[PDB]
Design a protein around this motif. Sequence first.
Motif, short mmCIF file in Angstrom:
data_model
loop_
_atom_site.label_atom_id
_atom_site.label_comp_id
_atom_site.label_asym_id
_atom_site.label_seq_id
_atom_site.Cartn_x
_atom_site.Cartn_y
_atom_site.Cartn_z
N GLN A 256 10.80 36.48 26.52
CA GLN A 256 10.37 36.40 25.13
C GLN A 256 10.82 35.13 24.43
O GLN A 256 9.99 34.42 23.87
N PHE A 257 12.12 34.83 24.44
CA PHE A 257 12.63 33.69 23.69
C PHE A 257 13.71 32.99 24.50
O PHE A 257 14.54 33.62 25.15
N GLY A 258 13.68 31.65 24.45
CA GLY A 258 14.60 30.82 25.19
C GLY A 258 15.96 30.69 24.52
O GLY A 258 16.24 31.29 23.48
N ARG A 259 16.81 29.88 25.15
CA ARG A 259 18.17 29.68 24.68
C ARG A 259 18.72 28.39 25.27
O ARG A 259 18.36 28.00 26.38
N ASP A 260 19.59 27.73 24.51
CA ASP A 260 20.15 26.45 24.90
C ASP A 260 21.48 26.62 25.63
O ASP A 260 21.86 27.73 26.02
N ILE A 261 22.19 25.51 25.82
CA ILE A 261 23.51 25.56 26.44
C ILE A 261 24.51 26.26 25.52
O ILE A 261 25.29 27.11 25.95
N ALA A 262 24.49 25.91 24.23
CA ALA A 262 25.40 26.47 23.25
C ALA A 262 25.01 27.88 22.80
O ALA A 262 25.57 28.39 21.83
N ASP A 263 24.05 28.50 23.50
CA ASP A 263 23.65 29.88 23.24
C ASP A 263 23.09 30.06 21.83
O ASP A 263 23.55 30.89 21.05
N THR A 264 22.08 29.25 21.51
CA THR A 264 21.30 29.41 20.28
C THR A 264 19.82 29.34 20.62
O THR A 264 19.42 28.62 21.54
N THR A 265 19.02 30.09 19.87
CA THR A 265 17.59 30.19 20.16
C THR A 265 16.91 28.84 19.97
O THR A 265 17.18 28.11 19.01
N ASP A 266 16.00 28.51 20.89
CA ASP A 266 15.18 27.32 20.79
C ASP A 266 13.69 27.61 20.76
O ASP A 266 12.98 27.02 19.95
N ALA A 267 13.20 28.49 21.63
CA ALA A 267 11.78 28.77 21.75
C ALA A 267 11.53 30.25 21.55
O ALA A 267 12.39 31.08 21.85
N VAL A 268 10.35 30.57 21.03
CA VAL A 268 9.94 31.94 20.75
C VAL A 268 8.48 32.11 21.17
O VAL A 268 7.64 31.23 20.91
N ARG A 269 8.19 33.23 21.82
CA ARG A 269 6.82 33.64 22.11
C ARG A 269 6.32 34.50 20.96
O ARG A 269 7.02 35.43 20.52
N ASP A 270 5.12 34.21 20.48
CA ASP A 270 4.56 34.98 19.38
C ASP A 270 4.18 36.37 19.87
O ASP A 270 3.41 36.49 20.83
N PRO A 271 4.69 37.43 19.25
CA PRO A 271 4.36 38.79 19.72
C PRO A 271 2.92 39.21 19.43
O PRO A 271 2.50 40.27 19.91
N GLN A 272 2.17 38.42 18.66
CA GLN A 272 0.77 38.73 18.36
C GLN A 272 -0.18 38.00 19.29
O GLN A 272 -1.00 38.63 19.97
N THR A 273 -0.09 36.67 19.34
CA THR A 273 -0.90 35.86 20.24
C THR A 273 0.00 35.26 21.31
O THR A 273 1.14 34.87 21.03
N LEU A 274 -0.51 35.21 22.54
CA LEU A 274 0.28 34.77 23.69
C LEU A 274 0.41 33.25 23.64
O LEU A 274 -0.44 32.50 24.14
N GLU A 275 1.50 32.79 23.04
CA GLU A 275 1.79 31.37 22.91
C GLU A 275 3.30 31.17 22.84
O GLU A 275 4.06 32.13 22.70
N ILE A 276 3.72 29.91 22.95
CA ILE A 276 5.13 29.55 22.92
C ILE A 276 5.33 28.46 21.88
O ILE A 276 4.54 27.51 21.79
N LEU A 277 6.38 28.60 21.06
CA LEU A 277 6.73 27.62 20.04
C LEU A 277 8.20 27.28 20.20
O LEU A 277 8.96 28.07 20.77
N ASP A 278 8.61 26.11 19.73
CA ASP A 278 10.03 25.76 19.74
C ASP A 278 10.53 25.48 18.33
O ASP A 278 9.80 24.96 17.49
N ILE A 279 11.78 25.85 18.08
CA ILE A 279 12.37 25.85 16.75
C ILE A 279 13.49 24.82 16.70
O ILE A 279 14.35 24.80 17.58
#
Lengths: 49, 50
Positions: free
Chosen positions: B2-25
């Motif tokens: 569902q959602f990625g994570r960095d080295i320092a354990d903070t969220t970077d990427a999220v998959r939209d639960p409505q449309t199948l896509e990936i975004l980065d924050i």
Amino acid sequence: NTLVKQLSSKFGAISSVLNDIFSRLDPPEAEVQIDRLITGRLQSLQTYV
Amino acid sequence: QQFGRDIADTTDAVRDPQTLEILDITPCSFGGVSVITPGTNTSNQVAVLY
Ligand SMILES: *[C@@H]1O[C@H](CO)[C@@H](O[C@@H]2O[C@H](CO)[C@@H](O)[C@H](O)[C@H]2NC(C)=O)[C@H](O)[C@H]1NC(C)=O
């Protein structure tokens, strides 16, 4: 790296995320939890310095 | 996954639960401010450094 990783530690509290404690627990205990976290992070910063 | 994570354990990427896509924050910009100035007796103009 040690300084940045120090954040995730509970420091004796029940969680390391502020929003969960604020939206899930009453302010009177939020006081002591936030005090614990602040004390821990100040100690870490002073050690690094 | 569902959602990625960095080295320092903070969220970077999220998959939209409505449309199948990936975004980065990324947190929006922040920094420090410095003030450059001569002596007060000389002038009252200043410069800013972000
Ligand atoms: C679930 O999300 C999908 C998107 O992936 C929705 O399908 C879209 O429907 C619109 C019109 O209703 C189309 O224009 C899009 O092309 C569709 N997407 C794809 C990838 O083809 C679907 O409607 C959603 N399901 C519900 C119940 O709302």
